[PDB]
Design an enzyme around this catalytic site. Structure first.
Site, PDB file in Angstrom:
ATOM      1  N   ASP A  26      10.695   0.934 -18.651  1.00 10.16           N
ATOM      2  CA  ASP A  26      12.092   1.275 -18.851  1.00 10.16           C
ATOM      3  C   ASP A  26      12.264   1.705 -20.320  1.00 10.16           C
ATOM      4  O   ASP A  26      11.297   1.732 -21.118  1.00 10.16           O
ATOM      5  CB  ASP A  26      13.014   0.110 -18.425  1.00 10.16           C
ATOM      6  CG  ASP A  26      14.407   0.575 -17.970  1.00 10.16           C
ATOM      7  OD1 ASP A  26      14.849   1.649 -18.415  1.00 10.16           O
ATOM      8  OD2 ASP A  26      15.064  -0.149 -17.193  1.00 10.16           O
ATOM      9  N   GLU A  57      25.089  -1.448 -16.507  1.00 15.03           N
ATOM     10  CA  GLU A  57      24.246  -2.344 -17.277  1.00 15.03           C
ATOM     11  C   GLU A  57      25.079  -3.430 -17.879  1.00 15.03           C
ATOM     12  O   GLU A  57      25.989  -3.924 -17.219  1.00 15.03           O
ATOM     13  CB  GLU A  57      23.478  -1.562 -18.340  1.00 15.03           C
ATOM     14  CG  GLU A  57      22.541  -0.555 -17.735  1.00 15.03           C
ATOM     15  CD  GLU A  57      22.481   0.729 -18.526  1.00 15.03           C
ATOM     16  OE1 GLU A  57      22.023   1.748 -17.944  1.00 15.03           O
ATOM     17  OE2 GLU A  57      22.882   0.719 -19.716  1.00 15.03           O
TER      18      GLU A  57
HETATM   19  C1  LIG Z   1      21.069   7.761 -22.727  1.00 10.19           C
HETATM   20  O1  LIG Z   1      19.938   6.899 -22.415  1.00 10.19           O
HETATM   21  C2  LIG Z   1      20.138   5.486 -22.446  1.00 10.19           C
HETATM   22  O2  LIG Z   1      20.331   4.994 -21.125  1.00 10.19           O
HETATM   23  C3  LIG Z   1      20.054   3.592 -21.101  1.00 10.19           C
HETATM   24  C4  LIG Z   1      20.244   3.045 -19.698  1.00 10.19           C
HETATM   25  S1  LIG Z   1      19.020   1.807 -19.582  1.00 10.19           S
HETATM   26  C5  LIG Z   1      17.661   2.368 -18.615  1.00 10.19           C
HETATM   27  O3  LIG Z   1      17.649   3.777 -18.726  1.00 10.19           O
HETATM   28  C6  LIG Z   1      16.703   4.430 -17.895  1.00 10.19           C
HETATM   29  C7  LIG Z   1      16.651   5.890 -18.322  1.00 10.19           C
HETATM   30  O4  LIG Z   1      17.924   6.548 -18.209  1.00 10.19           O
HETATM   31  C8  LIG Z   1      17.078   4.172 -16.420  1.00 10.19           C
HETATM   32  O5  LIG Z   1      16.199   4.860 -15.512  1.00 10.19           O
HETATM   33  C9  LIG Z   1      17.037   2.667 -16.128  1.00 10.19           C
HETATM   34  O6  LIG Z   1      17.454   2.370 -14.760  1.00 10.19           O
HETATM   35  C10 LIG Z   1      17.880   1.908 -17.163  1.00 10.19           C
HETATM   36  O7  LIG Z   1      17.625   0.494 -17.080  1.00 10.19           O
HETATM   37  C11 LIG Z   1      20.906   2.768 -22.067  1.00 10.19           C
HETATM   38  O8  LIG Z   1      20.144   1.620 -22.446  1.00 10.19           O
HETATM   39  C12 LIG Z   1      21.335   3.474 -23.335  1.00 10.19           C
HETATM   40  O9  LIG Z   1      22.651   3.004 -23.569  1.00 10.19           O
HETATM   41  C13 LIG Z   1      21.360   4.996 -23.218  1.00 10.19           C
HETATM   42  O10 LIG Z   1      21.390   5.602 -24.516  1.00 10.19           O
END
Ligand SMILES: CO[C@@H]1O[C@H](CS[C@@H]2O[C@H](CO)[C@@H](O)[C@H](O)[C@H]2O)[C@@H](O)[C@H](O)[C@H]1O
Ligand SMILES: CC(=O)N[C@@H]1[C@@H](O)[C@H](O)[C@@H](CO)O[C@H]1O
Ligand SMILES: CC(=O)N[C@@H]1[C@@H](O)[C@H](O)[C@@H](CO)O[C@H]1O
Ligand SMILES: CC(=O)N[C@@H]1[C@@H](O)[C@H](O)[C@@H](CO)O[C@H]1O
Length: 606
Positions: A289, A495
């Site tokens: 992740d 989240e």
């Molecule tokens: C803009 O990118 C960032 O998104 C994350 C969401 S957490 C994590 O992100 C992955 C890639 O988008 C997902 O596939 C996965 O399911 C998620 O757990 C966030 O942490 C930031 O706020 C954000 O900048």
């Protein structure tokens, strides 16, 4: 096989494993570690991609070439990155990933499907397969080859901010909905070996079963936290759908930020290598992740050298860095150079990454197809979303007493009707999180039909429709209305921002329902990612519908309200009486629900 400058890995007629081995055997360490590196488009440039031999890019939530970008703008962006990658010595194409988790949802004009919890309410795996099929087409419309979906979390506590990304608290329902995978990727052939990766071709995308494992089991639903449960419970609740995913050829698996009995998943060799790879025989690639390896330590990022060692030794293959690629590559190179990480581990990671890329046809079709651009937001896909939205709706009440006339279905012809509430005319709210931004947004953020718009499209021409967002009791009593449709609920979230210990909807919500229903017969449409405190809403309302987060196609809601179709949805989750009861799931000892899993009233079509 024939020309003098022949290179076996570039020959499309050769077996995937022969192509993988042929290419692997030519690669330098830098080229190998490059494959293992995924970076944000925000830090990518042609030189960066070439010079570091980068294997993959992603758009995180809201990472877009610009607001309102067309399908063609996305294709041109992706192709620009691909051109740089194909110009390296070996010309290994990159794979571009994105969260297309309810349609191609970062993209303006993309069809937005109901979130997973509502899809669980349908009990219709074939519908979910067809949604996978449509989503693959809309992802490929934008030049993207890889979707970070399905989330096969089994959410055991609705206080979790990602509970709407879980089809159900019952693993059996989640298992059934792994049909998304062959929708996204294509059906696997007759004789398919469980655990092998599969993608049919250029009109399909690689999928990702996430987040491995126990992401839905965390203490008090705290996002990214500890899941405290014995192996038997892990294997009985949180694991089963991963085996279904293996059987259907899921190409990738993403590791969870969460821990299991205090061990970080991103450092868990026993589960990642011992179980997923060695026992389930998974042969696709394992991806971290976002800054997942960083978060192994406390504080996060405080020993990145250890993060890299722990994660790669645990068995992770590709790292979603996503920004500090130079440091990631430098540290991993140093570990290999110093014997801390053996070449066997690097070679396994690269074998898996290359296996997925060769299998899915990426070396044969590295570039976007401009004829696919028109798949974005296609009416046929919106019709499917509208079907899914309607099927997702769970009717909780249809009359205050057993002797009242049932309110639903409502007549399309009436002199004057009221549509009210904060969620009656707000597209962003009805889509919820992971729509345009990660956290979602408010208002007209993309192309769709709000509940108000859907009502106006449905009713007889003689029916006058009045909208008031938050009318007072007098306005309603004085209005000469036949009935009201009032829509309220949760604001968009994802989240940790969605983690919520009280699960009561924001005001004004209840106060508007009370004012409307106090003056005229009312059907309350509750928009939420999960069960929320509902007794007060129920007490005021003649009818009440749990519509979840139904997406862009609000006519799904009105299709059921006006009786074009009957209500058929059944709760995929327990509806609690009080948050003090939580966690509380079907099959527990003290099970005292307001509405049990499986509950749902029905109507017949007019
Ligand atoms: C803009 O990118 C960032 O998104 C994350 C969401 S957490 C994590 O992100 C992955 C890639 O988008 C997902 O596939 C996965 O399911 C998620 O757990 C966030 O942490 C930031 O706020 C954000 O900048
Ligand atoms: C394994 C894990 O993530 N544990 C965290 C802990 O570190 C943190 O202090 C607590 C409150 O935020 O939430 C939980
Ligand atoms: C009635 C109440 O306290 N509601 C709270 C809300 O104010 C807060 O924004 C949210 C954050 O988790 O939790 C809930
Ligand atoms: C309001 C209404 O029509 N309810 C009916 C119910 O009486 C009938 O048993 C069922 C099967 O036909 O269809 C529904």
């Amino acid at each position: 096989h024939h020309a003098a400058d022949y290179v076996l890995y570039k020959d499309a007629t050769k077996p995937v494993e022969d192509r993988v081995a042929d290419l692997l055997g030519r690669m330098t360490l830098a080229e190998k570690i490059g494959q293992m590196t995924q970076i944000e488009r925000l830090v990518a440039t042609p030189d960066v991609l070439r010079d570091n031999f980068i294997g993959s890019l992603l758009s995180g939530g809201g990472s877009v070439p610009r607001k309102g970008a067309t399908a063609k703008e996305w294709q041109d962006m992706v192709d620009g990155f691909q051109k740089a990658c194909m110009s390296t010595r070996l010309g290994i194409p990159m794979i571009y990933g994105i969260d297309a988790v309810h349609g191609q949802n970062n993209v303006y004009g993309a069809t937005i499907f109901p979130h997973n919890v509502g899809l669980g309410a349908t009990r219709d795996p074939y519908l979910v397969k067809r949604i996978g099929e449509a989503t693959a087409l809309e992802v490929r419309a934008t030049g993207i080859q890889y979707a970070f979906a399905p989330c096969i979390a089994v959410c055991r506590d609705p206080r979790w901010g990602r509970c709407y990304e879980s089809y159900s608290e019952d693993r059996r329902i989640v298992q059934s909905m792994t049909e998304l995978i062959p929708g996204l990727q294509g059906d696997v052939p007759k004789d398919f070996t469980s655990g092998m990766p599969f993608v049919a071709g250029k009109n399909k995308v690689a999928a990702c079963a996430k987040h491995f494992v126990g992401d839905g089991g965390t203490v008090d639903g705290i996002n990214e936290n500890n899941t405290i449960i014995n192996r038997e419970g892990l294997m009985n609740i949180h694991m089963p759908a991963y085996k279904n995913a293996m059987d259907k050829g899921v190409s990738t698996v993403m590791i969870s930020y969460s821990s299991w009995n205090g061990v970080k998943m991103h450092a868990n060799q026993d589960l990642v290598t011992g179980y997923l790879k060695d026992t389930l025989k998974f042969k696709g690639f394992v991806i971290s992740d976002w800054e997942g390896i960083d978060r192994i330590t406390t504080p996060a990022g405080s020993d990145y050298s250890y993060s890299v060692k722990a994660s790669i030794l645990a068995g992770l293959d590709m790292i979603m860095v996503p920004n500090k690629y130079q440091q990631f590559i430098s540290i991993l190179t140093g570990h290999v150079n110093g014997g801390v990480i053996p070449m066997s581990r690097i070679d396994d990671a690269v074998t898996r990454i290359l296996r997925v890329k060769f299998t899915m046809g990426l070396f044969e079709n590295p570039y976007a197809d401009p004829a696919m651009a028109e798949q974005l937001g296609k009416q046929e896909h919106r019709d499917l979303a509208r079907e899914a939205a309607r099927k997702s709706l769970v009717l909780l009440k249809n009359g205050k007493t057993s002797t009242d006339a049932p309110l639903l279905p409502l007549p399309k012809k009436a002199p004057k009707i009221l549509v009210a509430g904060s969620h009656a005319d707000n597209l962003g709210y009805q889509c919820g999180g992971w729509t345009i931004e990660a956290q979602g947004d408010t208002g007209r953020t993309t192309v769709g039909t709000t509940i108000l718009e859907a009502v106006k499209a449905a009713v007889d021409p003689s029916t006058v429709v009045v909208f008031a967002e938050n009318p007072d009791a007098e306005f309603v009593k004085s209005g000469g209305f036949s009935y009201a449709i009032v829509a309220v609920g949760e604001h968009p979230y994802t989240e940790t921002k969605g983690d919520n210990l009280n699960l009561t909807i924001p005001e004004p919500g209840l106060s508007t329902v009370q004012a409307v229903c106090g003056g005229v017969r009312c059907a309350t449409v509750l928009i939420s990612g999960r069960p929320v405190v509902v007794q007060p809403l129920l007490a005021a309302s003649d009818a009440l519908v749990a519509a979840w987060l139904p997406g862009s196609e609000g006519q799904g809601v009105t299709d059921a309200l006006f009786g074009d179709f009957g209500f058929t949805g059944r709760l995929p989750r327990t509806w609690f009486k009080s948050v003090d009861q939580l966690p509380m799931n079907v099959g527990d000892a003290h099970y005292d629900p307001l509405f049990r899993l499986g509950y749902g009233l029905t109507t017949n079509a007019t």
